[PDB]
């Protein structure tokens, strides 16, 4: 049944009453979530997740923190999937139409990186323009092209991603997310208990989500 | 504490001058800081402890 070796639970006091039903913890000043209730939430989780991924999966593996950002620009990034691994530039969904050209400048630039003007102008402008592009790259990588409108959303840490999720809620976008003992649920349709800032429950489920979009209907 | 006659245990809850030392410094509990003071005030009255360091 279990597969999460050592993600057991996490998070001490800072608990959110509403996250009681998914708790059975009480180990030394910290809750262990209800392991045996998290897995029935891979059922439903990766299910309506894939059930749409074959209907065609457009995702947004949204998850930040200089401590798991790169481990999101991964097979999470790779597949039928888009992502954000830095500061969730607010209104990026709700104001996509303004931000849509924050994109044109990323391309119309890199498309021009080993092309267009580049080694020319000044060797001032140079890295003094790749700073324009470096900045853009993180926070606005995964976006690059959005071909199929943001369709579901998968987030690592419910509340830490206040804004992201809120926006979804506003635009009618499923929001699949894992929620720590401390975080507010109910912002999340398909809620996933368990730790949300340890190198494992990430990768595990993260990489496990990459494994279900990346395959649904050949 | 338990007793005002304990001047020995008591003389480590007062300064050179003889001022009671606040619970905050000694880290005592509430219920006892009072028992402490009272025992001190007793012993001062019975000339078992100076009110003052003016002698």
């Amino acid at each position: 049944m279990l597969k999460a070796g050592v993600h057991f639970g996490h998070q001490t006091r800072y608990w959110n009453p509403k996250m009681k039903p998914f708790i059975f913890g009480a180990r030394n000043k910290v809750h262990i979530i209800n392991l045996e209730k998290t897995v029935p939430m891979f059922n439903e989780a990766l299910a309506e997740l894939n059930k749409i991924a074959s209907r065609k999966g457009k995702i947004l593996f949204v998850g930040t923190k200089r401590a798991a950002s790169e481990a999101v620009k991964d097979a999470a990034l790779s597949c039928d999937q888009f992502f954000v691994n830095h500061r969730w530039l607010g209104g990026m969904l709700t104001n996509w139409k303004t931000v849509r050209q924050s994109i044109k400048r990323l391309k119309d630039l890199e498309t021009q990186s080993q092309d267009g003007t580049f080694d020319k102008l000044t060797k001032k402008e140079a890295l003094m323009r790749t700073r324009e592009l470096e900045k853009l790259e993180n926070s606005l990588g995964g976006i690059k092209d959005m071909g199929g409108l943001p369709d579901a959303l998968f987030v690592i840490d419910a509340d830490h991603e206040h804004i992201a999720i809120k926006e979804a809620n506003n635009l009618g976008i499923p929001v699949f997310a894992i929620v720590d003992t401390n975080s507010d649920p109910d912002g999340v349709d398909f809620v996933i208990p368990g730790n949300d800032d340890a190198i494992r429950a990430v990768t595990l489920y993260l990489g496990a989500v990459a494994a279900t979009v990346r395959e649904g209907r050949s | 504490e338990i007793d005002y006659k304990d001047i020995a245990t008591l003389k480590n809850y007062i300064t050179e001058s003889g001022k009671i030392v606040p619970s905050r410094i000694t880290g005592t509990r509430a219920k006892y800081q009072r028992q402490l003071a009272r025992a001190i005030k007793r012993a001062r009255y019975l000339s078992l402890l100076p009110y003052t360091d003016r002698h």
């Binding site: - | 300064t15 050179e16 001058s17 001022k19 360091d53």
Partner: protein, 51 residues
């Protein structure tokens, strides 16, 4: 209060007085009676001393 300082030195060494008396209970008792207004004082001394 008391420093019975001994042999090899010339300096005052009485940092003692900045541990109790002087501007302590002295600046205190020097003036306006107070009464119920220290209560208003010390009521800010905890609102402060909470953090």
């Amino acid at each position: 209060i008391k420093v019975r300082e001994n042999e090899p030195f010339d300096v005052a060494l009485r940092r003692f007085k900045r541990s109790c008396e002087k501007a302590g209970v002295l600046a205190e008792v020097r003036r306006r009676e107070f009464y119920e207004k220290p209560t208003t004082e010390r009521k800010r001394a905890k609102a402060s001393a909470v953090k």
